[PDB]
mmCIF file of C-alpha atoms in Angstrom:
data_model
loop_
_atom_site.group_PDB
_atom_site.id
_atom_site.type_symbol
_atom_site.label_atom_id
_atom_site.label_comp_id
_atom_site.label_asym_id
_atom_site.label_seq_id
_atom_site.Cartn_x
_atom_site.Cartn_y
_atom_site.Cartn_z
ATOM 1 C CA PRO A 1 -16.506 -5.809 3.892
ATOM 2 C CA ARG A 2 -18.094 -2.960 1.959
ATOM 3 C CA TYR A 3 -21.318 -3.268 -0.017
ATOM 4 C CA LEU A 4 -20.301 -4.724 -3.381
ATOM 5 C CA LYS A 5 -21.773 -6.346 -6.480
ATOM 6 C CA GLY A 6 -20.501 -8.340 -9.426
ATOM 7 C CA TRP A 7 -17.501 -10.635 -9.306
ATOM 8 C CA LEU A 8 -15.965 -8.654 -6.433
ATOM 9 C CA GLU A 9 -18.949 -9.574 -4.268
ATOM 10 C CA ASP A 10 -18.534 -13.169 -5.444
ATOM 11 C CA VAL A 11 -14.863 -13.378 -4.464
ATOM 12 C CA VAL A 12 -15.554 -11.686 -1.117
ATOM 13 C CA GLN A 13 -18.190 -14.323 -0.341
ATOM 14 C CA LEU A 14 -15.669 -17.018 -1.262
ATOM 15 C CA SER A 15 -12.984 -15.442 0.925
ATOM 16 C CA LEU A 16 -15.318 -15.258 3.922
ATOM 17 C CA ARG A 17 -15.696 -19.047 3.609
ATOM 18 C CA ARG A 18 -12.013 -19.801 2.913
ATOM 19 C CA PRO A 19 -10.957 -22.584 5.325
ATOM 20 C CA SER A 20 -7.915 -21.766 7.423
ATOM 21 C CA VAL A 21 -4.911 -23.894 6.522
ATOM 22 C CA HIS A 22 -3.110 -26.319 8.842
ATOM 23 C CA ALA A 23 0.570 -25.597 8.254
ATOM 24 C CA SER A 24 3.614 -24.684 10.332
ATOM 25 C CA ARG A 25 6.044 -22.006 9.218
ATOM 26 C CA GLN A 26 9.611 -23.248 8.703
ATOM 27 C CA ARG A 27 10.968 -20.079 7.122
ATOM 28 C CA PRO A 28 12.350 -16.755 8.377
ATOM 29 C CA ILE A 29 10.365 -13.572 7.854
ATOM 30 C CA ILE A 30 11.980 -11.259 5.291
ATOM 31 C CA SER A 31 10.481 -7.772 5.277
ATOM 32 C CA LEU A 32 9.563 -6.764 1.733
ATOM 33 C CA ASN A 33 9.168 -3.026 2.338
ATOM 34 C CA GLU A 34 12.510 -2.867 4.164
ATOM 35 C CA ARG A 35 14.279 -4.824 1.410
ATOM 36 C CA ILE A 36 12.902 -2.294 -1.085
ATOM 37 C CA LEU A 37 14.480 0.519 0.942
ATOM 38 C CA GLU A 38 17.761 -1.417 0.929
ATOM 39 C CA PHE A 39 17.586 -1.698 -2.867
ATOM 40 C CA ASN A 40 16.815 2.030 -3.094
ATOM 41 C CA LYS A 41 19.949 2.778 -1.053
ATOM 42 C CA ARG A 42 22.078 0.659 -3.402
ATOM 43 C CA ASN A 43 20.315 2.218 -6.424
ATOM 44 C CA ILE A 44 19.085 -1.165 -7.663
ATOM 45 C CA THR A 45 15.731 -1.078 -9.428
ATOM 46 C CA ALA A 46 13.309 -2.961 -7.175
ATOM 47 C CA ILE A 47 10.967 -5.247 -9.129
ATOM 48 C CA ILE A 48 8.291 -7.369 -7.463
ATOM 49 C CA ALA A 49 7.672 -10.114 -10.021
ATOM 50 C CA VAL A 50 4.020 -11.149 -10.259
ATOM 51 C CA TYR A 51 3.405 -14.832 -10.957
ATOM 52 C CA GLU A 52 0.247 -15.730 -12.902
ATOM 53 C CA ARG A 53 -0.908 -19.346 -12.893
ATOM 54 C CA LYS A 54 -2.622 -19.681 -16.281
ATOM 55 C CA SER A 55 -2.263 -17.876 -19.593
ATOM 56 C CA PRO A 56 -5.407 -15.988 -20.696
ATOM 57 C CA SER A 57 -5.132 -17.434 -24.225
ATOM 58 C CA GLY A 58 -3.918 -20.464 -26.152
ATOM 59 C CA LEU A 59 -0.369 -19.114 -26.340
ATOM 60 C CA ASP A 60 1.824 -21.586 -24.444
ATOM 61 C CA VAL A 61 3.545 -19.046 -22.206
ATOM 62 C CA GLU A 62 2.680 -20.740 -18.908
ATOM 63 C CA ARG A 63 5.598 -20.966 -16.483
ATOM 64 C CA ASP A 64 6.285 -23.638 -13.890
ATOM 65 C CA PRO A 65 5.779 -21.996 -10.474
ATOM 66 C CA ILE A 66 9.081 -23.224 -9.045
ATOM 67 C CA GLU A 67 11.214 -22.567 -12.130
ATOM 68 C CA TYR A 68 9.810 -19.033 -12.392
ATOM 69 C CA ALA A 69 10.501 -18.312 -8.722
ATOM 70 C CA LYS A 70 14.024 -19.736 -8.927
ATOM 71 C CA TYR A 71 14.676 -17.718 -12.079
ATOM 72 C CA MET A 72 13.627 -14.454 -10.421
ATOM 73 C CA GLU A 73 15.382 -15.067 -7.109
ATOM 74 C CA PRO A 74 18.765 -13.449 -7.979
ATOM 75 C CA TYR A 75 17.176 -10.297 -9.447
ATOM 76 C CA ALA A 76 13.716 -9.490 -8.078
ATOM 77 C CA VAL A 77 13.265 -7.701 -4.769
ATOM 78 C CA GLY A 78 10.316 -10.001 -4.063
ATOM 79 C CA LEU A 79 7.628 -12.192 -5.564
ATOM 80 C CA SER A 80 3.849 -11.767 -5.645
ATOM 81 C CA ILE A 81 1.909 -15.055 -5.565
ATOM 82 C CA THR A 82 -1.867 -15.026 -6.051
ATOM 83 C CA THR A 83 -3.694 -17.511 -3.818
ATOM 84 C CA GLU A 84 -7.238 -16.738 -5.008
ATOM 85 C CA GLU A 85 -8.668 -19.948 -6.437
ATOM 86 C CA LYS A 86 -11.742 -19.309 -8.585
ATOM 87 C CA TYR A 87 -10.698 -16.440 -10.866
ATOM 88 C CA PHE A 88 -6.884 -16.516 -10.652
ATOM 89 C CA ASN A 89 -6.299 -20.289 -10.347
ATOM 90 C CA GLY A 90 -4.036 -19.905 -7.321
ATOM 91 C CA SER A 91 -3.894 -22.062 -4.221
ATOM 92 C CA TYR A 92 -2.331 -22.185 -0.782
ATOM 93 C CA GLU A 93 -0.361 -25.299 -1.754
ATOM 94 C CA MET A 94 1.281 -23.394 -4.609
ATOM 95 C CA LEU A 95 2.349 -20.620 -2.233
ATOM 96 C CA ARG A 96 3.760 -23.121 0.265
ATOM 97 C CA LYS A 97 5.839 -24.912 -2.380
ATOM 98 C CA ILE A 98 7.216 -21.641 -3.766
ATOM 99 C CA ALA A 99 8.041 -20.266 -0.318
ATOM 100 C CA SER A 100 9.976 -23.400 0.622
ATOM 101 C CA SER A 101 12.013 -22.971 -2.591
ATOM 102 C CA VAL A 102 13.284 -19.366 -2.446
ATOM 103 C CA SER A 103 14.756 -17.033 0.163
ATOM 104 C CA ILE A 104 13.455 -13.660 -1.033
ATOM 105 C CA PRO A 105 10.295 -11.921 0.245
ATOM 106 C CA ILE A 106 6.934 -13.334 -0.844
ATOM 107 C CA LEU A 107 3.786 -11.207 -1.058
ATOM 108 C CA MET A 108 0.538 -13.159 -0.787
ATOM 109 C CA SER A 109 -1.997 -11.575 -3.154
ATOM 110 C CA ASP A 110 -5.607 -12.471 -2.403
ATOM 111 C CA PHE A 111 -8.856 -10.813 -1.312
ATOM 112 C CA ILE A 112 -8.299 -10.705 2.447
ATOM 113 C CA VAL A 113 -11.430 -9.987 4.477
ATOM 114 C CA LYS A 114 -10.790 -11.933 7.686
ATOM 115 C CA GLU A 115 -7.961 -12.441 10.152
ATOM 116 C CA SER A 116 -7.587 -16.172 9.518
ATOM 117 C CA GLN A 117 -6.375 -15.393 5.993
ATOM 118 C CA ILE A 118 -3.407 -13.529 7.480
ATOM 119 C CA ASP A 119 -2.778 -16.519 9.746
ATOM 120 C CA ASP A 120 -2.740 -18.666 6.597
ATOM 121 C CA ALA A 121 -0.237 -16.359 4.903
ATOM 122 C CA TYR A 122 2.137 -16.499 7.860
ATOM 123 C CA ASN A 123 1.793 -20.251 8.382
ATOM 124 C CA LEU A 124 2.406 -20.916 4.677
ATOM 125 C CA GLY A 125 5.627 -18.877 4.538
ATOM 126 C CA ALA A 126 4.530 -15.555 3.051
ATOM 127 C CA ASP A 127 6.331 -12.446 4.291
ATOM 128 C CA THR A 128 3.465 -9.991 3.811
ATOM 129 C CA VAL A 129 -0.041 -9.715 2.400
ATOM 130 C CA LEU A 130 -2.084 -7.489 0.114
ATOM 131 C CA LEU A 131 -4.936 -5.431 1.558
ATOM 132 C CA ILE A 132 -7.433 -3.760 -0.788
ATOM 133 C CA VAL A 133 -9.056 -0.561 0.452
ATOM 134 C CA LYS A 134 -12.041 -0.785 -1.889
ATOM 135 C CA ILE A 135 -13.432 -4.014 -0.392
ATOM 136 C CA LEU A 136 -12.979 -3.110 3.291
ATOM 137 C CA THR A 137 -14.495 -0.558 5.615
ATOM 138 C CA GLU A 138 -12.102 1.940 7.171
ATOM 139 C CA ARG A 139 -12.294 0.157 10.530
ATOM 140 C CA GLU A 140 -11.794 -3.300 9.015
ATOM 141 C CA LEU A 141 -8.705 -2.030 7.187
ATOM 142 C CA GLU A 142 -7.331 -0.586 10.425
ATOM 143 C CA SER A 143 -7.961 -3.851 12.275
ATOM 144 C CA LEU A 144 -6.372 -6.082 9.633
ATOM 145 C CA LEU A 145 -3.411 -3.703 9.334
ATOM 146 C CA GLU A 146 -2.755 -3.916 13.074
ATOM 147 C CA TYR A 147 -3.282 -7.686 12.930
ATOM 148 C CA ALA A 148 -0.726 -8.207 10.160
ATOM 149 C CA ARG A 149 1.794 -6.032 11.999
ATOM 150 C CA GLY A 150 1.422 -8.381 14.969
ATOM 151 C CA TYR A 151 3.129 -11.004 12.804
ATOM 152 C CA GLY A 152 5.879 -8.572 11.829
ATOM 153 C CA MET A 153 4.310 -7.943 8.419
ATOM 154 C CA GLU A 154 3.876 -4.556 6.810
ATOM 155 C CA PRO A 155 1.057 -5.206 4.311
ATOM 156 C CA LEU A 156 0.929 -3.638 0.879
ATOM 157 C CA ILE A 157 -2.229 -1.502 0.843
ATOM 158 C CA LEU A 158 -3.677 -1.262 -2.667
ATOM 159 C CA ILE A 159 -5.375 1.967 -3.747
ATOM 160 C CA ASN A 160 -7.256 2.881 -6.913
ATOM 161 C CA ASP A 161 -8.418 6.480 -6.425
ATOM 162 C CA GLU A 162 -8.337 9.617 -4.286
ATOM 163 C CA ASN A 163 -10.738 8.241 -1.674
ATOM 164 C CA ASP A 164 -8.649 5.084 -1.247
ATOM 165 C CA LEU A 165 -5.511 7.188 -0.822
ATOM 166 C CA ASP A 166 -7.147 9.463 1.748
ATOM 167 C CA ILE A 167 -8.124 6.457 3.870
ATOM 168 C CA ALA A 168 -4.709 4.818 3.517
ATOM 169 C CA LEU A 169 -2.800 7.923 4.601
ATOM 170 C CA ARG A 170 -5.121 8.570 7.544
ATOM 171 C CA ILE A 171 -4.697 5.057 8.967
ATOM 172 C CA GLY A 172 -0.912 5.303 8.693
ATOM 173 C CA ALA A 173 -0.165 3.001 5.776
ATOM 174 C CA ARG A 174 3.579 2.837 5.134
ATOM 175 C CA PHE A 175 3.543 0.549 2.055
ATOM 176 C CA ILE A 176 1.150 1.549 -0.737
ATOM 177 C CA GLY A 177 0.471 -0.074 -4.107
ATOM 178 C CA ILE A 178 -1.198 1.853 -6.918
ATOM 179 C CA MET A 179 -3.375 0.083 -9.466
ATOM 180 C CA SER A 180 -3.092 0.871 -13.159
ATOM 181 C CA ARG A 181 -6.480 -0.650 -14.038
ATOM 182 C CA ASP A 182 -9.730 0.927 -12.916
ATOM 183 C CA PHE A 183 -11.431 -1.180 -10.256
ATOM 184 C CA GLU A 184 -14.926 -0.852 -11.745
ATOM 185 C CA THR A 185 -14.093 -1.075 -15.474
ATOM 186 C CA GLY A 186 -10.818 -2.998 -15.856
ATOM 187 C CA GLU A 187 -9.386 -0.379 -18.219
ATOM 188 C CA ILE A 188 -5.717 0.556 -17.920
ATOM 189 C CA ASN A 189 -5.276 4.256 -17.086
ATOM 190 C CA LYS A 190 -1.622 5.155 -16.556
ATOM 191 C CA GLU A 191 -2.566 8.844 -16.322
ATOM 192 C CA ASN A 192 -4.683 8.418 -13.188
ATOM 193 C CA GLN A 193 -1.966 6.193 -11.716
ATOM 194 C CA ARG A 194 0.719 8.847 -12.177
ATOM 195 C CA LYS A 195 -1.553 11.462 -10.587
ATOM 196 C CA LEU A 196 -2.023 9.386 -7.430
ATOM 197 C CA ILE A 197 1.686 8.528 -7.258
ATOM 198 C CA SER A 198 2.592 12.221 -7.202
ATOM 199 C CA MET A 199 0.333 12.792 -4.175
ATOM 200 C CA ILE A 200 1.896 10.119 -1.938
ATOM 201 C CA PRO A 201 4.316 11.503 0.695
ATOM 202 C CA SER A 202 7.941 10.708 -0.025
ATOM 203 C CA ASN A 203 8.448 8.698 3.178
ATOM 204 C CA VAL A 204 5.797 6.150 2.113
ATOM 205 C CA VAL A 205 7.090 3.177 0.122
ATOM 206 C CA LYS A 206 5.059 3.401 -3.084
ATOM 207 C CA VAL A 207 4.664 0.683 -5.694
ATOM 208 C CA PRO A 208 2.780 1.071 -8.993
ATOM 209 C CA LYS A 209 1.455 -2.048 -10.683
ATOM 210 C CA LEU A 210 2.384 -2.389 -14.351
ATOM 211 C CA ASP A 211 1.518 -5.036 -16.925
ATOM 212 C CA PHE A 212 3.774 -3.786 -19.730
ATOM 213 C CA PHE A 213 6.546 -1.221 -19.597
ATOM 214 C CA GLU A 214 9.193 0.591 -21.590
ATOM 215 C CA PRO A 215 12.582 1.202 -19.912
ATOM 216 C CA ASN A 216 12.091 4.972 -20.210
ATOM 217 C CA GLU A 217 8.779 4.718 -18.342
ATOM 218 C CA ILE A 218 10.528 3.130 -15.356
ATOM 219 C CA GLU A 219 13.165 5.864 -15.142
ATOM 220 C CA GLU A 220 10.508 8.584 -15.318
ATOM 221 C CA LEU A 221 8.620 7.043 -12.393
ATOM 222 C CA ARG A 222 11.799 6.512 -10.361
ATOM 223 C CA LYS A 223 12.433 10.222 -10.995
ATOM 224 C CA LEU A 224 9.196 10.965 -9.127
ATOM 225 C CA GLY A 225 10.386 8.866 -6.175
ATOM 226 C CA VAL A 226 8.656 5.551 -6.860
ATOM 227 C CA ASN A 227 10.363 2.908 -4.732
ATOM 228 C CA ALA A 228 9.520 -0.356 -6.513
ATOM 229 C CA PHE A 229 7.398 -1.828 -9.285
ATOM 230 C CA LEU A 230 4.885 -4.670 -9.426
ATOM 231 C CA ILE A 231 5.214 -6.154 -12.925
ATOM 232 C CA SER A 232 3.143 -9.004 -14.347
ATOM 233 C CA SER A 233 2.353 -9.535 -18.027
ATOM 234 C CA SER A 234 5.698 -8.497 -19.514
ATOM 235 C CA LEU A 235 7.625 -10.850 -17.218
ATOM 236 C CA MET A 236 5.258 -13.790 -17.742
ATOM 237 C CA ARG A 237 5.759 -13.507 -21.512
ATOM 238 C CA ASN A 238 9.515 -12.815 -21.246
ATOM 239 C CA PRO A 239 10.956 -13.587 -17.796
ATOM 240 C CA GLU A 240 14.475 -12.624 -18.925
ATOM 241 C CA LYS A 241 13.327 -9.011 -19.270
ATOM 242 C CA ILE A 242 13.906 -8.639 -15.522
ATOM 243 C CA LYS A 243 17.647 -8.712 -16.254
ATOM 244 C CA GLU A 244 17.153 -5.594 -18.415
ATOM 245 C CA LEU A 245 15.541 -3.674 -15.535
ATOM 246 C CA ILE A 246 18.473 -4.279 -13.160
ATOM 247 C CA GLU A 247 21.600 -3.826 -15.286
#
């Protein structure tokens, strides 16, 4: 990985030590990026619903992992499940149980720094994985991208700034996610996100991450050629809102 400090260094050190899981895939592979293109062709808004394990406050808005996934299955283009344990309270067992319960694409969201983590994703039933440019060297990103494609996965490559985007385009990323929060400060900056979006070539499948939204904001981004949306907070607090993004 790159030279890091703070909690990002801490989670990288944890991920380097993550034991590989002993599981056997009993699930087809459903390409998430290609399903997004199918939704685009049918003019159906493509929402990747982000599941969060625990609520950040005492408000009892926690969702059962299976009920949430089953609720989203008829509407979402895919699901994002976070398997990081220390800060996000995820687990491999939670991913496995969700994947055996639904038949739509599952994105494994974690801090992937070694090949065995992609093995884990495949063996547990995930259809693709998240790769984060900021924590990897250019050559590590290239290697892990080729490695995931050897499983038939097109990973979602997550960028935060102009340097990230430059690397991603040069290595031939076809599936790019754009953060709305700054990586170093945690502050939401929709303005910087829209700037990066507008620089991505049209033939790349591009996916901004959004916590909250207004319906008009979605249409404006779709107008720029955004292909799909990663949405978290608004759907955890009100899962039924996904029905308002489709109809």
